[PDB]
Write a protein that binds this ligand. Structure first.
Ligand SMILES: O=C([O-])CC(=O)C(=O)O
Ligand SMILES: O=C([O-])CC(=O)C(=O)O
Ligand SMILES: O=C([O-])CC(=O)C(=O)O
Ligand SMILES: O=C([O-])CC(=O)C(=O)O
Ligand SMILES: O=C([O-])CC(=O)C(=O)O
Ligand SMILES: O=C([O-])CC(=O)C(=O)O
Lengths: 225, 225, 225, 225, 225, 225
């Protein structure tokens, strides 16, 4: 379980999955990733295919986490965690929490990680509010999308964007909630770890595959003469 | 067209596709690859999915080549080329050639590249025979699979295996047929190009993705402390 | 038609379908069931697969009923009935009714059973209200889910839960509406039939299949020595 | 691009697609249609199938337009336009417009035609309101569905229905917005073109295919004796 | 049943299906066709999709006939008939016959029409041979494909091709076997019917749909000015 | 592993799977079955669906065995065993064995159970021959299909059919090969176990589900009055 790793002092490393293919899931698992975030928000993916991917993740012994926007269905498929994007108010979080629990004291019939991602400045302002919900386990930083929402390209990582992120960690960590970082560089990892952060999402598969392939091919032509 | 590139003095670069997902096809096209070899031999892939991939390749402006073992169906799907594995005798090639042509003087109803891959030592012995069929455009070297067929791991690339490969090029090039190389290193490319070789397949997507991801993740943990 | 059976004094027997496979549908039809309730609420099922199941039910001559939560789409697929879960207020029912009718006096373009299931105590309180909508044909008792919503395990069927159910029948039957029971035992059937009840749902396929198989296998090992 | 045609003085002809098959898309493209309106409102169609159709349209060089009711997902699939049905208020249009734009000044991440269809009399009354949104490119007349919403069969095309349609064009054309007509006869085309209309949707594939086939078969039996 | 129609003196009309979509099947059935020939030879179609189409044909009350090249699987799917293409020798027919029968005296486990199509001149020469197999019910003329196999375009329907066809009927009809014609014109129907022919396949859906659509659209532009 | 169970003195119980749905697989696993025989011979099942089922079996911790008639593909999908039907000669077995092994000394690239099923009297006669192949692990009795092949209904289990079966065990057990029985009654299990038999297939899911459901429903109506 993902909690189970975090309670042992373990660092866990994950990646976004933009390609709804079971072989890609098995490839990620073989690469050493502790979990994979199956992104259903920006992927045209059938419900049965999502179930296929969750089964594939389990058979490959990699933790299936699904980024949603039907919460019941995904959790009924066997997802061990739910990342909810663009969380602004606390109303959203408490509703998600009881969407993931049993009747009578929930809206689901018969240790899943309830995760909220902060990607709008509104979510940053209500962070003290948001990060105290009973049921919320993890809060994921989304500095890039947050930057883009402020009319500021993430390419120039301004101080204000970074300030909003560090303010998120401090608040989240103050209530004993888990923090998850999205480091752009591999040395931002060591910086977060020293602060106590254990959970890290390292980009998305489609993004890293394009970068490696196009560059490797470029060198292949370059070396060819 | 692939011939059309080869007739202009152009070098063309391709890759094996082990993941039957249209997004992977579009990723390969965006990486700069001139063609993609959709491998249907070692991929559990539905016939409608294969058609989906060929459409995806066309919309991404990358040349669809299918490695088979139903030749009609694939060619009816819009594949611009057929790579046939484990070709040993000439009987096979001539049959494939007329499987790709019109009635009356073919077995197909209403510039596709007819490609044969040499992966067994039997194919190496009948190479002078094989590489003269009217209709055969390209012969693909498969040194690794050939090595494995000789009870010799490809990890140790022996002289005999390399000798069988260079004998293939010389014979194939003598009859004005196209040669396609599978370089293990990027400097084997320059060596083939100096001999006149224009077509190159650079590994398989699944293989390169595993190698990049697992290593990048390893460095990510390494840098983390 | 399902109404057509009910207007003839016929008893009709159905079952919940938790396995979105056309063969399972055909198996249910061959077992003698008058209808099958394709459960789309707790089944990861593609929209095209649901259409496949409805076609399969029709070709097997078994009445297709779909339990929803897109009402138009299901009815456009050929479903002869709609079971709506967790109905609490009357506002819901009247909206469903006109979701199943023609323009101008509906929200659907060009004898379908409109069915509401009571599973929350709120639905029990508004039962006199709910069971008088023009357009509502059937009301399905859901004692188990109702029990679970009251913090009471259905395993102990308390008097209060049973009281809420019998109060539902009396009210529903008073307005000439059809009642559908979910008997836990096969002798609860005779009791409902004596009251005039004609419609019965006998569990779910997945539930009965697990119970039969696991027990039969257990006896198989037991007999083996 | 569709705008690009309209800015050149070109007339463009499209058709509704009720059959979610890539071959049907390719058939439409080969018939000479400039665009095809993939109708997802009254078609049981998987999300991955919709992506398949958009790829098929692109490879067949026909413009993919999707009629919706997930706007992000369709636009992420590569749709060049969105037709939104039953637009009544302006609130709807402005929301759709910013659903199709970038953050910060939209709700979509990283020349698409924003199209609204008028099918209710409410949409006709708010037409001066609706047809001035910054971001709205085209307004599609839907006289038949509008007729059916007024308790009047479209079979008798009354003056009032036709009046509501001509009032739509005049208002829409006054704000420099594109008008799209649904002519029942082929001579209603010349009438709209003289008014400046360039965009025309000629029925739906399923409708025209049934009409041609059933009639042709009827003549086939008739001629047979 | 198809035999059942033929034994009553009924004429039956069918069409080739090149589009593996259940809606297309239902469209054909609604057009009045007695049967539909699901062409699996030149259609990329999954096995589960073929089963979907057979179910769709049954629910639409149109006879499912499948043109193959796995005979067991199709017959296990519920196909009421099998059309086998390019039959040359009698060995083929007798094998197909016992592929469609029960063990012990067949190769299939637990009134299907066994149909052979003549499309090569070899099949024409062995017609007296072929058309006497115990188990063979129908022989389908394929003049066009036969013409194309003789290096002669079907566009010019020569006397020799027509002679081979009329020789087929005479032989087939002499052994009390059913004849099926593929008339290019609707008056070739009356000619065959006078000879006793009852079964007629009128082109393919994809072919007729392209012809109607492209022409209708052409007139639409023509009328527009 | 299945061998691993058999080498420990463990009895293993399996069932035939006629319904290609992952939920059915998970239901079988939960019922306590040690393995499931995914029957691809009499099931319309896509190749990707078969891969889905194998993943589902692994995630449910039940051993995936596939009954075939593409051996490479299934084994590449992760099947832990292959049951080959209607084995008559030894030529078949030796070919299957080296279809499941590595190059050079096989036809497969980079503890799987190689299983042969005897269902024809020809297989019974060559049993001393068949059951000595190096590579063949298990031989499955198929008395019913064998009976049906002898023009004898399995409903009357004659002495000759039973004699052919007991002759199979004796021969198979003499060469230290694994025997797998298909008991019609649960007390035929104890009889085989006393002879040393450890592997048992208890019918098929579809068969047992029909029998339980139709009977249970019958009692439900019977009890109802
Ligand atoms: O909704 C139903 O019909 C019952 C159920 O499983 C729930 O959602 O609590
Ligand atoms: O086989 C047929 O029925 C006709 C055809 O298109 C071919 O294969 O030449
Ligand atoms: O919405 C549309 O475009 C037309 C239609 O069939 C409806 O929903 O009444
Ligand atoms: O929602 C997210 O996680 C990020 C994103 O691509 C967006 O929707 O702006
Ligand atoms: O092949 C089998 O395993 C049994 C069977 O149904 C057949 O093909 O006669
Ligand atoms: O066939 C190929 O192209 C190579 C391969 O993996 C094999 O089958 O040994």
């Amino acid at each position: 379980s993902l909690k189970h790793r975090l309670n042992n002092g373990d660092s866990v490393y994950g990646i976004f999955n933009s390609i709804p293919d079971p072989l890609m899931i098995e490839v990620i698992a073989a690469s050493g990733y502790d979990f994979v975030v199956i992104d259903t928000e920006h992927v045209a993916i059938n419900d049965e295919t999502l179930a296929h991917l969750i089964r594939a993740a389990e058979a490959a012994h990699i933790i299936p986490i699904v980024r949603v926007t039907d919460i019941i269905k995904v959790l009924d498929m066997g997802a061990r965690g739910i990342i909810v994007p663009h969380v602004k108010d606390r109303e959203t979080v408490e509703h998600i929490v009881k969407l993931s629990r049993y009747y009578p004291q929930g809206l689901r019939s018969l240790h899943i990680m309830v995760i909220a991602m902060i990607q709008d400045v509104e979510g940053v302002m209500a962070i003290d509010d948001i990060a105290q919900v009973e049921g919320l386990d993890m809060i994921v930083e989304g500095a890039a999308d947050l930057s883009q929402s402020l009319g500021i390209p993430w390419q120039t990582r301004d101080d204000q964007v970074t300030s909003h992120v560090q303010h998120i960690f401090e608040v989240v960590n103050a209530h004993g909630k888990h923090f998850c970082a999205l480091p752009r560089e591999d040395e931002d990892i060591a910086k977060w770890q020293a602060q106590g952060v254990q959970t890290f999402i390292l980009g998305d598969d489609r993004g890293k595959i394009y970068r490696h392939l196009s560059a490797s091919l470029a060198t292949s032509k370059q070396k060819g003469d």
